[PDB]
Amino acid sequence: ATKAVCVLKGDGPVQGIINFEQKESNGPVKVWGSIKGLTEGLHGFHVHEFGDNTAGCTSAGPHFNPLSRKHGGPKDEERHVGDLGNVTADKDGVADVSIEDSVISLSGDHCIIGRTLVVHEKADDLGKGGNEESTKTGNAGSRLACGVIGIAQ
Amino acid sequence: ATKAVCVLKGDGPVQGIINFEQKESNGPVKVWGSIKGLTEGLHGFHVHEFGDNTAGCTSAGPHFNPLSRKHGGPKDEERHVGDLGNVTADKDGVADVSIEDSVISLSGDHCIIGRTLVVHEKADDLGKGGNEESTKTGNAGSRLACGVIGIAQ
Ligand SMILES: [Zn+2]
Ligand SMILES: [Zn+2]
């Protein structure tokens, strides 16, 4: 696949549509779209391991981290495959997403099709929050909305 | 063995969890779980091409049919990859699913991870309905509920 899409929903008002496009299988993945219903400010934006929503967002499990690294920000050498940093919500709760990543893929081992995209309660501290939880989830807190990443037309 | 799962939801009361499991890459896929909120009787149970829920179940598109064949029942040589036939709902609206299929896969060209599982309004006529539409969708009608097939623990 060269295109993917994720519909984000949760227990509250957080909702959105996130697009994915990868023209070359060894090139970067463009990640774009919008999320509404967030509090103003920074929110962690991660690919979690499982495309399992049986129990809500919790069933998606830990961060997608097949190379077993500690948590970092997208520009860090050391980070999970699923570490896409933070998205930024405006005063109206709207976060416009426009990201380009070369670690995630729409194919092969780093393939995220069938996994889960999650927008978190708080800002992802990129591994520099200065405690143990920081080197794991970036202290991004709870799962506000999620969706299984699906093959798109 | 790779494992997958799908949460079925729609506009109405149809809801269900469907599990997928495949021990070997050339093995058959066990699929099983339950669906409630269905009218008593038969319901088409099909894998559609896209894991895109942006406009509901409609956006999943057509049947997963990469070999461009005519629609049939699961046992038929002539069938869509996505042709899993029908499920049966009892008098309390509950459809227990337990299927084994060797055309679908959780890997390769027939992989369904990231595609959409759909439970339909009417019975799938397995291409034995005697009309043009029978040979395309089995006249299963409406999409009651769907979910993207995601990777599972
Ligand atoms: Zn991480
Ligand atoms: Zn079909």
Side-chain angles (χ1 to χ4, degrees), chain A residues 1-8 10-74 76 78-90 92-121 123-153, chain B residues 1-22 25-29 31-69 71-131 133-135 137-153:
Chain A
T2 51
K3 295 201 83 204
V5 72
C6 190
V7 166
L8 261 27
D11 54 324
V14 170
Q15 63 191 316
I17 292 166
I18 298 314
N19 302 103
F20 310 82
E21 180 181 83
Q22 197 184 16
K23 301 296 207 176
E24 267 79 46
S25 59
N26 72 328
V29 180
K30 273 130 165 254
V31 184
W32 81 102
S34 304
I35 309 172
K36 58 177 192 191
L38 272 359
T39 52
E40 188 170 8
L42 251 44
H43 295 263
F45 195 64
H46 313 131
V47 185
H48 290 240
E49 199 178 1
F50 302 112
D52 179 335
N53 186 79
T54 47
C57 301
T58 74
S59 33
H63 280 193
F64 183 43
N65 175 35
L67 302 183
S68 267
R69 311 215 186 287
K70 68 193 183 155
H71 178 73
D76 298 309
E78 178 98 355
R79 52 103 124 192
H80 306 142
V81 162
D83 285 346
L84 301 191
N86 291 294
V87 296
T88 295
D90 69 12
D92 292 317
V94 185
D96 198 279
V97 179
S98 228
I99 287 153
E100 200 175 279
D101 201 72
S102 287
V103 180
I104 62 164
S105 203
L106 291 196
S107 46
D109 298 329
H110 288 183
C111 178
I112 67 177
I113 294 314
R115 300 196 192 262
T116 294
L117 183 63
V118 174
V119 56
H120 294 255
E121 166 181 9
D124 175 6
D125 75 30
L126 311 187
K128 307 280 180 211
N131 64 31
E132 185 175 53
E133 200 47 59
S134 175
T135 60
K136 283 179 220 174
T137 57
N139 289 299
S142 79
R143 319 180 171 191
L144 300 170
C146 61
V148 175
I149 301 176
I151 302 184
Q153 191 172 29
Chain B
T2 178
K3 249 177 123 192
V5 66
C6 196
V7 178
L8 276 359
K9 273 154 170 23
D11 289 322
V14 179
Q15 49 179 303
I17 299 167
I18 298 299
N19 304 104
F20 295 84
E21 181 177 86
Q22 187 174 29
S25 77
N26 63 313
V29 184
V31 8
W32 80 101
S34 187
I35 312 182
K36 62 185 177 183
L38 262 1
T39 60
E40 197 187 339
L42 271 26
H43 300 276
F45 190 63
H46 307 153
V47 186
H48 292 240
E49 186 170 10
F50 303 107
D52 180 335
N53 196 57
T54 49
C57 302
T58 295
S59 35
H63 286 180
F64 182 45
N65 187 27
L67 296 186
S68 301
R69 284 142 164 234
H71 167 75
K75 296 192 190 220
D76 292 330
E77 186 64 57
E78 189 76 11
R79 64 171 266 192
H80 301 156
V81 169
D83 281 351
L84 297 174
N86 287 301
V87 292
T88 307
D90 67 14
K91 66 227 176 45
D92 309 301
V94 179
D96 244 70
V97 178
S98 194
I99 295 174
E100 183 162 281
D101 200 74
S102 308
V103 174
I104 56 167
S105 207
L106 298 188
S107 44
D109 323 327
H110 293 178
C111 178
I112 63 180
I113 290 335
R115 302 200 189 267
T116 287
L117 187 68
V118 179
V119 67
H120 286 267
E121 179 203 342
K122 308 186 136 201
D124 173 355
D125 66 31
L126 314 167
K128 255 84 222 229
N131 50 34
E133 187 61 46
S134 173
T135 222
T137 67
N139 289 277
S142 248
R143 318 194 166 186
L144 302 183
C146 54
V148 175
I149 307 173
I151 298 175
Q153 174 145 42

